[PDB]
């Protein structure tokens, strides 16, 4: 397919844009899930994320079905859930979510917040973790917790790129 890589962004302040919304969730729920997903990474780095409402941002977020632009098509219900590109121009940093999945803010289907937090990891330069319990593990696992703690494997990875936070 169409691919972009660099190890990391050369700046600490990044922009994102929610291009379109899944019908499974409300605009407010989708916006909250993505905002928390960026918070996972800005809590432990100097990274900052600013949301844009039009134009082109560093991280363009969109929901698509099957072939959607990059010739890495989705596969319908289940299987591939999402993917994202490493840092760089154009597609670099972008996050794609398969809208053939039922996206929820809870546990009914696939948790948008969890998947997005993982993909934004990739958008920042992270690879997959060899640890099945790390966020960046490629297999989707639902936690069932009323909160999310970013595992240490994921903190060390993102801090090796951008350094620590507060």
């Amino acid at each position: 397919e169409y691919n972009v890589r660099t190890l990391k962004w050369s700046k600490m302040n990044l922009t994102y844009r929610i291009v379109n919304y899944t019908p499974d969730m409300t605009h407010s729920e989708v916006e909250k899930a993505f905002k928390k997903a960026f918070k996972v990474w800005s809590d432990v780095t100097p990274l900052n994320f600013t949301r844009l409402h039009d134009g082109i941002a560093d991280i363009m977020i969109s929901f698509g079905i099957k072939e959607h632009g990059d010739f890495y098509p989705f596969d319908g219900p289940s299987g591939l859930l999402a993917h994202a590109f490493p840092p760089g121009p154009n597609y670099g940093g972008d996050a794609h979510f398969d809208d053939d999945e039922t996206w929820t803010s809870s546990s009914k289907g696939y948790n948008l917040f969890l998947v997005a937090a993982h993909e934004f990891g990739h958008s920042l330069g992270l690879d997959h973790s060899k640890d099945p319990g790390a966020l960046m593990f490629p297999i989707y696992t639902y936690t069932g917790k009323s909160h999310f703690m970013l595992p240490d494997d994921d903190v060390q990875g993102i801090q090796s790129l951008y350094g620590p936070g507060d």
Binding site: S78, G79, L80, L81, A82, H83, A84, Y110, V115, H118, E119, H122, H128, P138, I139, Y140
Partner: peptide, 5 residues
């Protein structure tokens, strides 16, 4: 990349 099942 996230995968289920």
């Amino acid at each position: 990349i996230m995968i289920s099942f």
